[PDB]
Design a protein around this nucleic acid. Structure first.
Ligand SMILES: [Zn+2]
Lengths: 302, 207, 241, 222, 257, 466
RNA sequence: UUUAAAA
């Protein structure tokens, strides 16, 4: 019920890394090329980076705010992995360590870090608010699960549009989608996740009390590179030079200088992935609004 | 399981003890029963089913293992914490009546469904003597061995279960009530135990 | 409380400490010689954590058993009375708790010599009686001192320290009031080194400030190691003599 | 006109993607593989059918969706030639193409077609072929129309999801696999749509055969 | 516990004889030494930690909340959590339902001792945490909540408007906390406070509740083991029941000290 | 309580106090650290510079108080000034006077109460400490953290009496600490019972002079005595639905739309058909939580309460500036001289038209208003939930209280809010953020804010127009 | 609750 790795295959990939070689042909700091496929309705985003394929679905509904924060909206997210991405995922295991760590990283990146404008999702204080839900569907697993899922959710929230609501004192009328054009969600910053996989050609003893750092770090590992991984690190940055969130627990205990180096290497990656999502969203908007140049109302004078 | 929308609220509105005894009428389990009691402004209607004995795979116990479970029916839904409390008291009684040494490496599962508990004016004290008389009829219908019939009675919260024509007590339960009411509460249930004891035999011998 | 000064121009925080000062550290070893083989009552500030280590022993079922190493289980239970307002939720099966439980297992399964104890399981039971900011770091120091009491072979100490960044001023050992007003970073330093077995950042931090926060973080973690080490010296010397 | 692609996933034995109107369903088939204890069958092949909605978790709405899809694929697979084996068939609905709360016929029709396609790419023994179409009647004209759009369902009186079984070059109909209907209809309209549904599924398998040939043939001796 | 049938017959024959020889040699009216710690949780009003001789340790915390007693039925809710056992376990909900009856607001403890205004009153939250256990802990938790309630301090009332409380002064919780005892019958002898090995080979068990110098309502007769379950003569029911009436004042004199 | 010792002079104690809020009681326990490295911040001091510890930026604390303070007549002479909570809130403008105070010592227990009662007054007080130079010197001695001045609470002692004892102990320590340098400590407090309690403490005699007494002891007393301030709420509930029906039936009540004056947000003029002139509604209680444009039910006032059209300019921005948004059931001197100046005009005016009061709201004119955050209520370095003020663009409207954690980010941003409620206990209406329009004085952000305030539809045309 | 004209 688990992936069997032969001793010959395990030895080959490790020695290939000691010679600056990866089976897929990338570099030690080369992120996989990302592709965004927008669906029909708003909030339907399909992300394809490498052989890893993920699909996100954004929805929302009226719900009660928290008693401790009545001026903010809710953000729900659940990433249940089906046997579609691989027969090693037992269906119905929502408490899996991968599913748990994935949701908590994206939840910190979007909700806690202030990516989604929760204060703008408040309709009436302490009674009515928006509860935006992010359903992530893992289609084909080949490493970089939380890297692609974070790209899918961020591309989905920026592509989704919530229904329009007019407040008449205490009443709330949800305008049909055909009545009024839906309003897009407010996004403050764009958190992008970059994971790092670590290997040691030595052993655990030569790593605890060893000054010579012989660790090998690769950016965005594949499934075979992930199964042979020793230590794991996940950082999240934005184009504003801000560290959104960092999660490193277990594996090879690394030093502070290398972790700071991982962030500076990841910033050049998130900076390019950010401008791609901004460009691919611009191209998808012109696809739906072809004659948008004639329908402009606010026009300059002379 | 639908449960409907969470925005909906439930409705808010501002001497002689008749008895009915039955058994069988169930094909899933081996033995079942149905007791009904209507007296004063309170009615009781619960169904008991005994799914056993079932051989346990990989077990090596010297005697059987009884599993009693009370499940909320459709009216007067009690709290789940008190349902298992009475079940643990029911297991403490039937572990001395059912011949455990006869069924090694096997367990017996009991299912009592308090379907219709109604009051017309602790409320669970009045229902305990009716649950004991329903399991004994169901355990005997399943061909399981029991050392003498087991019954109980109520005497203002105090519930005492006797055996061997009331000579020896098998269980004791008391909630609310008063103080120093012991010998009178015992005799009020001792004569009530015999009222339920011979009535179970009269229903179990008919055809 | 109310609207307090987090870091005044006089360098004093809301509780009186300064930027590089720690809360009082009073650890206790072998507090449950009748409930577990390892015991540690961690009292870091207002925090009061009970950590038990039951093992290494045979697993209750032969289903899950690694014939080449040991199984490390961590059970973090946040009591309802951990804070002032009694918790109404369940806390036990919370998704935030499962992340902490897993992050602790990965952190120590690489530091604990599970190979020395094959075909065995090590159960770690944690009960938080009271919390007040920096609860993750205090969970770290409790497990370290509890395994040592159980006689489990480890490579080095694992220290838990919490650091906050208020504008342009790092703050060591953040309490609850400080975590609700700035970003928080919990570190997991190994011994007197700079090797990090844990690095949790849960709030936005500028990249130009994170390196200095990490340096001041690992520096305070070494100070946490000595306080635990000096506790074991005093406990071992009074036990032998 | 519907779109379909075969072999899109790299970590399953067979994958498929069925697109009709606005409904899109991706299926994944993996087998024969080692089953679990409660799943293994002594004589024939075991099936693990799992369908998932586009939004939210898998509620009881999709549970009846699994049980109906299970009854379509069970007689279609030669189960007896894979004793003590398992086959995972996961259907992921990307876009619903209708109203999830009020309807659930277009998703069942696409999950049946997507599952059959993924069963062909995985190389599982199939006794025949399959084709499923949604059918509803507008309350205005009261006539039978196939694959009704999302706006045509809200005005419909009764909905239908007919699944057939074709043999001999996709011509002879061996047996009617599934015909699930809900609404208001009589016996006169039942055969009025059953005869019309048999000729709309006949051109579907004829279109399916053309699709599953443009992709399998290049991978073989070519 | 888990023992061998060879030594089970030895302890059964030694506890059912007329001398009634106990394993550790203690008399049927004696107890084991108990350590109790109180007042160590500043975030809570009351607190207590109890440690038994066999290793059973239990911690109890007490919180308070102002609630309208005209809409709040029970003012004393007990939340029991046993380590290693599920919250929905059968052995956890039984004690949870049993302790809610020995400390019921109005029956076991009178609500007049925790009322404030004619509208509002204090609600007592009793959180129980069992770190370790080797026998039935319903008698150990009663000893823990007893010392916790008698060492509890609640804020003082200042006086229809919302009640206000003082900043510094806090009143003591003057409440008589009921006490729970466990009795095991071995053939024809009564044993007050059994052990892990005594309760394993016993015939039946008794649970008696003591409040205000008298045996109060919530009492049980649950079996202590599923192996040797025997029916008892009614003369044994009143023997052990009246036996606690003689030595329970000696318990309170040593516990309320 | 108890007290534990730590390293290098540190000591930790426990601070417990019950918090009453909304009828609930929550026992709050906190850690309190008592240290012995807190300096007097006096240039004359030669003992404290030896125990100072630099900050996080490794900066030694600078000593501010002048080595040659203001020398008065005997037996005061060269002295320092210690203030109280009441003295700061009362004469905050007098503190900022360049020819008045020079060397001032603000203890911690005073700064905590001033900030808890008026954050903008706390801001200008902290500003004096930061802007300390050659003509003005303000420090903050953290008396509650020093091991030499922290005073333990006594049984059944008033909370105000314990803090008063902390201020006395602070002046005792400062007097003893400065004896080698021959500098006295003057405690400026208007609390008469506080000064009488100090003269009984012969253990360490101090100087206790009130505000009017300290001013008279200065050389330029005649130039500042005229500038000293004088030494020292719930809205009426709306009528029931049955009474407003009977009032409008029998001619007791009237209905109309409020039109707030163009240059005063506290003077409403409801037009009624039974009067030749619009009925005035002057005052906070008479308007009764109503907004400009609502259909309200007014009740006439007796002729003894009739007023003239006010001739003063008042907007929500220049009124009650020393208030907190969360004020519910501190007086500025500038508002005293202005509110007492307009009362003299209505007394001699002959344009006295009938006045009324609002007793019921029938239709609300609430919507999405555009404005900006008031900086005086914003903590520009706290990412926590803080109640802030919103200055709406329509000067005929009041200030709105909103809760937000992006207050530092939303500063200098022209945002949009919507009012939720305004109960009788709250002084200001409750709103919440909904939309950010951009930076202030930005052409893109101002023109967009301009159209929203006039319901101008600037969104593109519909696709059905094609 | 700013007249008229072209915007
Ligand atoms: Zn000094």
């Amino acid at each position: 019920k688990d992936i069997e790795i032969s001793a010959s295959e395990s030895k080959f990939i490790l020695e290939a890394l000691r010679q600056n070689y990866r089976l897929d042909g990338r570099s030690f700091d080369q992120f996989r090329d990302v592709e965004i496929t927008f669906g029909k309705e708003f909030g339907d985003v399909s992300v394809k980076m490498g052989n890893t394929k993920v699909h996100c679905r954004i929805s929302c509904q009226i719900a009660q705010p928290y008693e401790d924060r009545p001026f903010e909206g809710l953000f729900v997210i659940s990433t249940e992995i089906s046997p579609m991405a691989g027969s090693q995922f037992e269906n119905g295991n929502i408490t899996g360590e991968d599913e748990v760590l994935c949701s908590r990283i994206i939840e910190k990146s979007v909700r806690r870090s202030g990516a989604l404008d929760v204060e703008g999702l408040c309709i009436v204080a302490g009674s009515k608010c928006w509860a935006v839900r992010a359903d992530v569907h893992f289609l084909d697993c080949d490493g970089g699960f939380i890297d692609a899922s974070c790209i899918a959710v961020m591309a989905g929230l920026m592509h989704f549009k919530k229904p329009d609501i007019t407040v008449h004192g205490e009443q709330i009328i949800v305008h049909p989608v055909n009545e009024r054009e839906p309003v897009p969600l407010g996004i403050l910053h764009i958190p992008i996740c970059v994971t790092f996989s670590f290997f040691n050609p030595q052993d655990t003893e030569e790593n605890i009390k060893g000054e010579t750092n012989s660790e090998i770090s690769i950016i965005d590992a594949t499934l075979k590179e992930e199964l042979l991984r020793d230590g794991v690190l996940t950082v999240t940055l934005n184009k504003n030079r801000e560290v959104v969130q960092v999660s490193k627990a277990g594996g090879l205990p690394m030093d502070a200088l290398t972790l700071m180096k991982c962030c500076h290497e990841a910033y050049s990656i998130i900076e390019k992935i950010t401008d791609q999502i901004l460009q691919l969203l611009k191209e998808d908007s012109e696809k739906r609004n072809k004659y948008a140049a004639m329908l402009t109302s606010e026009n300059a004078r002379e | 399981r639908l449960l409907g929308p969470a925005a909906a609220k439930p409705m808010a509105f501002s001497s002689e003890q008749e008895l009915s005894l039955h058994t069988g009428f169930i094909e899933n389990c081996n033995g079942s029963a149905l007791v009904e009691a209507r007296s004063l402004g309170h009615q009781t209607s619960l169904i008991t089913a005994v799914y056993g004995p079932r051989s346990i795979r990989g077990s090596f116990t010297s005697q059987g293992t009884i599993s009693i479970q009370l499940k909320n029916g459709l009216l007067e839904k009690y709290n789940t914490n008190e349902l298992k409390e009475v079940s643990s008291f029911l297991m403490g009684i039937f572990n001395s009546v059912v011949n455990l040494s006869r069924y090694p490496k096997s367990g017996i599962d009991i299912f009592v469904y308090l379907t219709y508990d109604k009051d017309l004016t602790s409320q669970i004290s009045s229902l305990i003597p009716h649950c004991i008389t329903s399991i004994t009829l169901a355990l005997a219908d399943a061909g399981i061995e029991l050392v003498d019939m087991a019954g109980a009675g109520e005497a203002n919260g105090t519930v005492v279960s006797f055996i061997k024509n009331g000579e020896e007590i098998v269980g004791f339960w008391k909630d609310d009530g008063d103080d120093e009411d012991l010998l009178e509460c015992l005799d009020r249930c001792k004569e009530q135990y015999n009222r339920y004891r011979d009535l179970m035999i009269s229903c179990l011998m008919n055809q | 409380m109310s609207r307090l000064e987090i870091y005044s121009p006089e360098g004093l925080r809301l509780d009186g400490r300064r930027w590089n000062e720690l809360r009082r550290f009073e650890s206790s070893i072998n507090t449950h010689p009748h409930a577990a083989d390892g015991s540690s009552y961690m009292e870091q500030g207002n925090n009061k954590i009970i950590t038990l280590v039951k093992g290494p022993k045979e697993p209750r079922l032969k289903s899950q058993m690694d014939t080449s190493k040991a199984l490390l289980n961590v059970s973090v239970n946040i009591t309802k009375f951990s804070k002032f307002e009694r918790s109404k939720s369940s806390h036990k099966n919370e998704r935030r708790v499962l992340e902490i439980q897993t992050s602790l297992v990965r952190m120590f399964e690489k530091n604990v010599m599970l190979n020395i104890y094959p075909r065995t399981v090590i159960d770690i039971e944690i009960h938080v009686l009271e919390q007040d900011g920096g609860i993750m770091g205090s969970l770290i120091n409790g497990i370290t001192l509890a395994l040592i009491d159980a006689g489990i072979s480890m490579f080095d100490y694992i220290s838990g320290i919490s650091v906050g960044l208020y504008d342009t001023t790092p703050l060591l050992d953040t309490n609850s009031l400080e975590e609700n007003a700035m970003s928080t970073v919990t570190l997991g330093v190994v011994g007197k080194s700079e090797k990090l077995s844990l690095l949790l950042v849960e709030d936005k931090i500028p990249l130009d400030r994170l390196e200095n926060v990490l340096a001041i973080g690992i520096a305070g973690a070494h100070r946490v190691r000595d306080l635990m080490d000096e506790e074991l010296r005093k406990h071992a010397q009074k036990r032998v003599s | 006109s519907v779109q379909a692609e075969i072999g899109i996933l790299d970590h399953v034995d067979g994958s498929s993607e069925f697109v009709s109107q606005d409904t899109k369903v991706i299926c994944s088939v993996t087998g024969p593989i080692e089953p679990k204890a409660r799943q293994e069958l002594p004589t024939q092949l075991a099936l693990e059918i799992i369908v998932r909605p586009a939004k939210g978790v898998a509620t009881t709405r999709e549970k009846v969706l699994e049980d109906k899809l299970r009854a379509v694929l069970t007689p279609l697979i030669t189960r007896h030639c894979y004793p003590r084996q398992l086959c995972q068939i996961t259907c992921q609905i990307l876009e619903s193409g209708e109203d999830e709360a009020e309807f659930s016929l277009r998703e069942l029709s696409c999950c049946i077609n997507a599952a059959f396609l993924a069963l062909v790419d995985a190389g599982i023994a199939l006794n025949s072929m399959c084709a499923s179409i949604p059918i509803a009647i507008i309350k205005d004209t009261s006539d039978i129309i196939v694959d009704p759009t999302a706006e045509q369902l809200k005005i419909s009186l009764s909905v239908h999801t007919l699944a057939l079984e074709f043999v001999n070059g996709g011509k002879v109909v061996k047996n009617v696999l599934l015909l699930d209907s809900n609404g208001d209809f009589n016996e006169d309209q039942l055969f009025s749509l059953l005869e019309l549904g048999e000729q709309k599924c006949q051109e579907l398998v004829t279109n399916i055969r053309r699709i599953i040939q443009d992709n399998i043939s290049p991978r073989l001796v070519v | 516990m888990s023992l061998s049938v060879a030594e089970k017959s030895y302890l059964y024959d030694s506890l059912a004889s007329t001398p009634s020889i106990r394993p550790d040699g203690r008399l049927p009216h004696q107890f084991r030494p108990i350590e109790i710690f109180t007042d160590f949780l500043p975030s809570s009003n009351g607190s207590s930690r109890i440690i038994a001789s066999d290793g059973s340790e239990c911690i109890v915390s007490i919180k308070s909340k102002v609630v309208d007693h005209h809409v709040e039925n029970e003012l004393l809710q007990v939340d029991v959590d046993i380590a290693g056992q599920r919250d929905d376990a059968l052995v956890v909900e039984t004690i949870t339902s049993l302790l809610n009856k020995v400390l019921k607001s109005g029956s076991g403890v009178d609500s007049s001792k925790l009322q404030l205004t004619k509208k509002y009153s204090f609600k007592i939250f009793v959180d129980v945490l069992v770190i370790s256990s080797h026998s039935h802990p319903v008698s150990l938790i009663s000893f823990a909540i007893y010392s916790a309630l008698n060492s509890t301090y609640l804020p003082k009332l200042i006086s229809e408007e919302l009640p206000t409380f003082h900043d510094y002064d806090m009143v003591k919780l003057d409440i008589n906390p009921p006490l729970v005892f466990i009795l095991a019958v071995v053939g024809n002898n009564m044993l007050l406070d059994p052990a892990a090995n005594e309760s394993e080979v016993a015939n039946n068990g008794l649970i008696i509740s003591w409040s205000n110098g008298k045996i109060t309502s919530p009492i049980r007769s649950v079996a202590l083991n599923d192996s040797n379950v025997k029916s008892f003569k009614p003369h044994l029911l009143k023997q052990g029941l009246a036996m606690v009436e003689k030595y329970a004042p000696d318990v309170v004199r040593s516990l309320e000290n | 309580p108890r007290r534990k010792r730590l390293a290098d002079g540190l000591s930790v104690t426990q601070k417990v106090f019950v918090r009453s809020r909304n009828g609930g009681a929550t026992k709050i326990v906190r850690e309190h650290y008592l240290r012995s490295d807190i300096p007097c911040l006096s240039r004359s001091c030669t003992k404290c510079p030896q125990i100072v510890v630099p900050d996080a930026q490794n900066e030694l604390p600078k000593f501010i108080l002048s080595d040659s303070p203001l020398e008065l007549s005997a037996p005061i002479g060269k002295h320092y000034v210690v203030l109280d909570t009441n003295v700061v809130l009362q004469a905050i403008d007098l503190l900022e006077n360049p020819n008045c105070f020079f060397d001032v010592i603000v203890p911690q227990i005073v700064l905590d109460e001033v900030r808890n009662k008026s954050y903008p007054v706390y801001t200008r007080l902290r500003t004096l400490c930061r802007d300390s130079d050659d003509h003005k010197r303000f420090i903050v001695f953290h008396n509650e953290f020093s091991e030499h001045t922290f005073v333990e609470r006594l049984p059944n002692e008033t909370i105000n009496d314990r803090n008063n004892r902390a201020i006395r102990k602070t002046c005792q320590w400062y007097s003893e600490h400065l004896k080698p340098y021959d500098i006295n400590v003057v405690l400026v407090t208007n609390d008469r019972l506080n000064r009488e309690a100090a003269t009984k403490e012969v253990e360490s005699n101090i100087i206790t002079k009130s505000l009017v007494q300290y001013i008279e002891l200065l050389p330029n007393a005649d130039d500042i005595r005229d500038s000293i301030p004088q030494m020292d709420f719930t809205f009426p509930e709306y009528y029931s639905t049955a009474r407003v029906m009977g009032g409008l039936k029998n001619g007791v009540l009237y209905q109309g739309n409020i039109q707030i004056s163009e240059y005063n947000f506290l003077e409403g003029s409801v037009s009624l058909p039974r009067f030749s002139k619009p009925v005035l509604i002057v005052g906070q209680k008479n308007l009764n939580r109503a907004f400009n444009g609502d259909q309200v039910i007014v009740e006439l006032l007796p002729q003894s309460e009739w007023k003239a059209p006010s001739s003063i300019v008042l907007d929500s921005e220049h009124f009650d500036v020393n208030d907190n948004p969360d004020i519910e059931a501190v007086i500025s001197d500038k508002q005293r001289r202005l509110l007492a100046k307009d009362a003299m005009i209505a007394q001699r005016s002959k344009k006295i038209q009938p006045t009324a009061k609002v007793v019921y709201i029938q239709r609300r004119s609430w919507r999405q208003y555009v404005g900006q955050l008031a900086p005086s209520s914003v903590d520009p370095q706290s990412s926590s939930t803080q109640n802030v003020f919103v200055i709406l663009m329509d000067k005929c409207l009041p200030k709105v209280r909103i809760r937000t954690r992006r207050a530092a980010e939303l500063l200098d941003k022209r945002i949009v809010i919507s009012i939720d409620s305004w109960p009788t206990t709250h002084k200001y209406p409750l709103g919440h953020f909904v939309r950010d329009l951009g930076t202030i004085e930005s052409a893109q952000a101002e023109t967009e804010a301009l159209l929203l305030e006039h319901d101008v539809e600037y969104r593109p045309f519909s696709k059905k127009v094609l």
